[PDB]
Enzyme design. Structure first.
Site, PDB file in Angstrom:
ATOM      1  N   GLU A 116      40.633  64.879  55.696  1.00 48.68           N
ATOM      2  CA  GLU A 116      41.034  65.874  56.713  1.00 48.68           C
ATOM      3  C   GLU A 116      41.515  65.215  58.008  1.00 48.68           C
ATOM      4  O   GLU A 116      42.254  65.828  58.757  1.00 48.68           O
ATOM      5  CB  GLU A 116      39.903  66.844  57.034  1.00 48.68           C
ATOM      6  CG  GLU A 116      39.517  67.691  55.846  1.00 48.68           C
ATOM      7  CD  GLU A 116      38.474  68.732  56.175  1.00 48.68           C
ATOM      8  OE1 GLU A 116      37.323  68.581  55.706  1.00 48.68           O
ATOM      9  OE2 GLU A 116      38.778  69.686  56.924  1.00 48.68           O
TER      10      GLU A 116
HETATM   11 ZN   LIG Z   1      36.437  70.416  56.191  1.00 43.35          ZN
END
Ligand SMILES: [Zn+2]
Ligand SMILES: [Cl-]
Ligand code: NA
Ligand SMILES: [Zn+2]
Ligand SMILES: [Zn+2]
Ligand SMILES: [Zn+2]
Length: 327
Positions: A116
């Site tokens: 992420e």
């Molecule tokens: Zn996450």
């Protein structure tokens, strides 16, 4: 060869309270073991991995043993420490070299992208087929380079959250839809994607209706976006292409405690979703599948995690292994 109906399980290289399971003690019902996680230090690019138990050589031999039994062992890059920042070529090369060194050292069959960090579109990065955000461009390039180094049998998987994929139906900016250029950029090398259908709240399907996580309709609606393709950000002229059905899996929590905010679905309800997706058999849900007859080559289920499943006396692995073996 890699099977047509898989159970892919995350394996904790750490004790989160559910205990550590040595590789040779992992249930044989899992087809692929995603070792969690390869991580980085200060340079946020050189990936490192050391097994939580025993020696490096012993872990390498455990992997060899599982591979000899037909299992695949993949290194997952992600978690809080799996911060991979690729602002430039130098960082990209450190990432490539470190991953190749780990694959060679331990004999991993491939990698799982569970990242992420920095995964958000720059303002003005609007074309998913030609991204301009350096993090995204460089990650795509690195994945293609690593994959090329091992050849066509390299196992490449990805596990983004729904905001980064199906969220693209609502918006293509910041985090929303930000994995779409990654998926498109590596689709010819992608073995399967298992989006995390958990810790997600609700998701808007291609029919414009909102579905709650942990329901059969939600599972079908979210998977169908990848099985059929969908318009990005309310624009019929910006279509995200369908993946092969054999590239589509659904990621689920093994038990409720594995995903506190929600996402767990009972085997009874999930089997309804699976029968619809795979066999085209509706179950009385509100969501209408894109393809009348279903998608028989749908690839299977991923779960967070092997360790959670074991603490719940193998309910998840047993239920779905039986379901897939019965087809
Ligand atoms: Zn996450
Ligand atoms: Cl199919
Ligand atoms: Na170690
Ligand atoms: Zn290539
Ligand atoms: Zn090499
Ligand atoms: Zn169609």
């Amino acid at each position: 060869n890699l099977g047509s109906k898989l159970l892919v399980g995350y394996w904790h290289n750490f004790d989160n309270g559910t205990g550590i399971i040595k590789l040779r003690d992992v249930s044989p019902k899992w087809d692929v073991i995603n070792v969690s996680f390869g991580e980085t230090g200060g340079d946020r690019s050189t990936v490192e991995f050391s097994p939580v138990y025993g020696t490096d050589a012993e872990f390498k031999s455990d992997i060899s043993y599982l591979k000899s039994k037909g299992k695949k062992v993949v290194l997952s890059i992600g978690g809080q420490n799996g911060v991979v920042l690729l602002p430039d070529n130098a960082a990209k090369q450190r990432f490539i070299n470190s991953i190749q060194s780990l694959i060679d050292k331990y004999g991993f069959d491939g990698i799982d992208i569970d990242l992420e960090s920095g995964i958000y579109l720059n303002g003005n990065d609007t074309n998913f087929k030609n991204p301009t955000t350096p993090q995204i461009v460089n990650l795509i390039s690195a994945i293609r380079t690593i994959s090329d180094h091992y050849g066509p049998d390299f196992l490449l998987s990805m596990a983004p959250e729904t905001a980064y994929v199906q969220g693209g139906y609502s918006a293509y900016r910041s985090i929303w839809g930000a994995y779409l250029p990654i998926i498109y950029g590596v689709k010819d090398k992608l073995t399967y994607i298992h989006v995390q259908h958990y810790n997600a709240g609700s998701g808007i399907g291609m029919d414009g209706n909102n579905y709650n996580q942990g329901t059969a309709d939600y599972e079908v609606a979210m998977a169908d976006m990848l099985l059929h393709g969908f318009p990005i950000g309310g624009n019929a002229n910006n279509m995200f292409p369908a993946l092969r059905s054999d590239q589509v899996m659904i990621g689920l929590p093994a038990t409720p405690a594995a995903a506190p905010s929600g996402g767990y679905i009972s085997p009874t309800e999930m089997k309804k979703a699976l029968d619809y997706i795979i066999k085209g058999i509706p179950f009385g849900g509100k969501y209408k599948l894109s393809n009348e007859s279903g998608y028989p080559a749908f690839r299977g289920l991923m779960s967070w995690s092997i360790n959670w499943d074991a603490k719940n006396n193998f309910e998840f692995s047993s239920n779905y292994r039986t379901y897939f073996d019965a087809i």
